[PDB]
From a paper:
SthCan2, with selenomethionine incorporated for phasing, was co-crystallised with [name]. There are four protein molecules in the asymmetric unit, which form two dimers each bound to a molecule of [name]. Unambiguous electron density in the Fobs – Fcalc map at 3σ at the interface between the CARF domains in the dimer of [name] corresponded to a molecule of [name] enclosed in the binding site. All interactions made between [name] and [name] are solely from the CARF domains. Hydrogen bonds form between [name] and main chain residues of Asp20, His21, and Lys99 and side chain residues of Ser19, Asp20, Thr42, Lys99, Tyr118 and Ser121 in both molecules of the [name] dimer. The structure of [name] bound to [name] represents the active state of the enzyme. There appears to be room in this cleft to accommodate canonical dsDNA if it is assumed that the flexible loop (Thr294–Asn304) can move to accommodate the DNA, allowing nicking by [name]. Clearly ssRNA as a smaller molecule could also be accommodated in this cleft. This analysis suggests that the mechanism of [name]-dependent activation is likely to be via allosteric structural reorganisation that opens the cleft, allowing access to DNA and RNA substrates.
Type III [name] systems detect foreign RNA and typically generate cyclic oligoadenylate (cOA) second messengers that bind to ancillary proteins with CARF ([name] associated Rossman fold) domains. Here we show that [name], a widely distributed CARF-superfamily protein associated with type III [name] systems, is a [name]-activated DNA nickase and RNase that can provide immunity against bacteriophage in vivo. [name] has two distinct domains, linked by a 15-residue highly flexible loop.
Residue numbers in the entry:
A (entry chain B): 11 to 156, 164 to 220, 225 to 298, 302 to 366
B (entry chain A): 3 to 155, 165 to 366
The structure:
RNA sequence: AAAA
């Protein structure tokens, strides 16, 4: 754990995981032209860990120049260890060659099997779960900004989602548009919202508060999904479970409905339905695909959870985009367990 | 010279992975006698994409299974390949680093040629001798899409040029007519002026009431043209001009791209330096207040172009209407080139295509 | 093709 040599590239996670697990004295970061901002991401991700960071520039596609930099590093730090997981194959082949020639340890992080491979001796080790959500987001340039009676309604809405589909969808729309006075047919649902004090009659009905409006504006379903994951957390080791995280990189901001870490992979659920004529899921699928790839990277996992049934086309695009889909709140607990395992 | 290497070296060994392009480009350029495809478990569909991409160039194809994360086992398979085909050449661009390190090691030990495809500089690097060669441009749009499992399914030119040149001064009038055309509102008002005279003279609008208190489109094709179609033609016509000096390939408008499960419509696509270029230039999504809302379009561009064109694919968002700072910042964040100033588009297209 |  003396000197750790990392090759920086699009995905910093496999360089950061070993440094958080077992802090070395020194990290040598091999960065490439126009990517010095990756050095700053690496510092931000490892801020919690006292460690000296040395930066060295190499060309992504120059075998000989990478061989020369590794030779220089091994002269100055003979007890160096190489993380060969990052970089181009040119960078990685060059560095492997010089570290092998000097009989040095060489590690590769396999996130599929959650193992560190020791390429020098063929051995391996299970990874821990060292990452927080803060550290994971930092690797992608992102930082975070941010009643008893109503939980009962949330469970009844979830259990009755098929038969109250249209009424709840319509109330979501009304709440989204901030339409101050609205009609609702007499029935179990109107009685329930009146008894729960979510709606009151107009001097027609109105929401009893902005909080009540937010709750009917798909807020109930966001809390339902979060509350299933708190239950599931009791039996599966989900980490850093958070609702309504607001993340920025200084150029864009994204809101994420529910996020957690499991086996060092960020899991993102989209379960706000207030984007979307009705509800328009196609615009939501494109957003999930775009944002989750930028925020959670290639090993990140995305789910689209809905109280309203999705069309065949929407389900086919989700399958095509590797987005797990639940449009049956009755089945969500079982589906969350299936998704998390996988 | 790659044609030369494939006369002396009969057998091309490549490692299959998410991006088949760097294995396919050398095979289309210079067809070898035999290809050995190293595929991994649950990814036999990559063998089928490779066959489909190289259908125009039938060779002998041998398939061999390897584990993505087993160094010693990949070393043994490469040893076996080199025993049976001693004149093998390795394309080390594909695969995991474990696959690639294992194969490199055995091919280096046997003093074999080893190539790596650099799409940034458009070069084949010969890792055995430090030499390199410019790639050609034999790749078609059909072959490119096959690597990602996809298949491809009047008087008014004067008006088009005047709209492009006057986009700043007619911004609001043209935006408003785009909205009307999008909503299919059949009868509309227009202030008297240069623009009304132009549309009347071009026969794009005709009067609908006396005293020109109302107008209508002269046809559905006239409506389509006012529904941002004029700007789509402007963009395509800049690419025809540029084609006269730059080797843009397979320039297409309004392409339908499908796999088994999804279809995507794309405004303008071409190949340049073996990279797929996608332009979004359709104006058809408005709010209730008639403003364009670009954010939903940016997410679609980001999602579709990454699936259809892969990580080296290039996307641009072109508009005649000014975009908000936030929309421009999301485009920058998502590596989408953005133009909201038709006066600058030619220069921006040249910058974009040359990175 | 810069954790495949």
């Amino acid at each position: 754990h003396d000197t750790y040599v990392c090759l920086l590239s699009d995905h910093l996670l496999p360089n950061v995981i070993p440094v958080i697990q077992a802090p070395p004295q020194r990290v040598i970061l091999l960065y490439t032209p126009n990517n010095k901002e990756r050095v700053q991401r690496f510092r931000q991700a490892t801020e919690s860990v006292p460690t000296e960071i040395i930066e060295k520039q190499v060309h992504p596609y120059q075998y000989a120049q990478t061989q020369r930099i590794c030779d220089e590093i091994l002269e100055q730090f003979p007890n160096a260890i190489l993380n060969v997981t990052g970089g181009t194959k040119i960078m990685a082949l060059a560095a492997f060659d010089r570290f092998r020639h000097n009989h040095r340890p060489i590690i590769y992080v396999d996130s599929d099997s959650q193992r560190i491979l020791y390429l020098h001796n063929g051995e391996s080790e299970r990874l821990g779960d060292p990452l927080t959500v803060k550290q994971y987001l930092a690797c992608y340039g992102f930082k975070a900004d941010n009643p008893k009676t109503w939980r009962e309604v949330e469970d009844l809405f979830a259990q009755n989602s098929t038969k109250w589909q249209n009424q709840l969808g319509r109330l979501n729309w009304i709440a989204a548009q901030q339409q101050p006075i609205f009609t609702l047919q007499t029935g179990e649902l109107q009685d329930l919202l009146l008894k729960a004090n979510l709606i009151k009659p107009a001097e027609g009905f109105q929401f009893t508060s902005d909080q009540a409006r937010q709750f009917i504006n798909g807020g109930w379903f966001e809390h339902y999904v979060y509350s299933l994951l708190r239950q599931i957390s009791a039996q599966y080791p989900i980490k850093n479970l958070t609702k309504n995280i607001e993340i920025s990189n200084d150029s864009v901001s994204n809101e994420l409905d529910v996020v957690f870490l499991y086996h060092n992979k960020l899991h993102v659920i989209e379960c706000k339905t207030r984007h979307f004529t009705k509800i328009n899921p196609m615009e939501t699928i494109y957003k999930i695909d775009s944002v989750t790839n930028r925020v959670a990277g290639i090993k990140g996992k995305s789910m689209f959870a809905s109280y309203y049934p999705l069309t065949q086309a929407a389900k086919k695009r989700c399958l095509n985009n590797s987005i797990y889909v639940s449009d049956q709140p009755s089945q969500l607990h079982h589906q969350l367990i299936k998704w998390i395992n996988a």
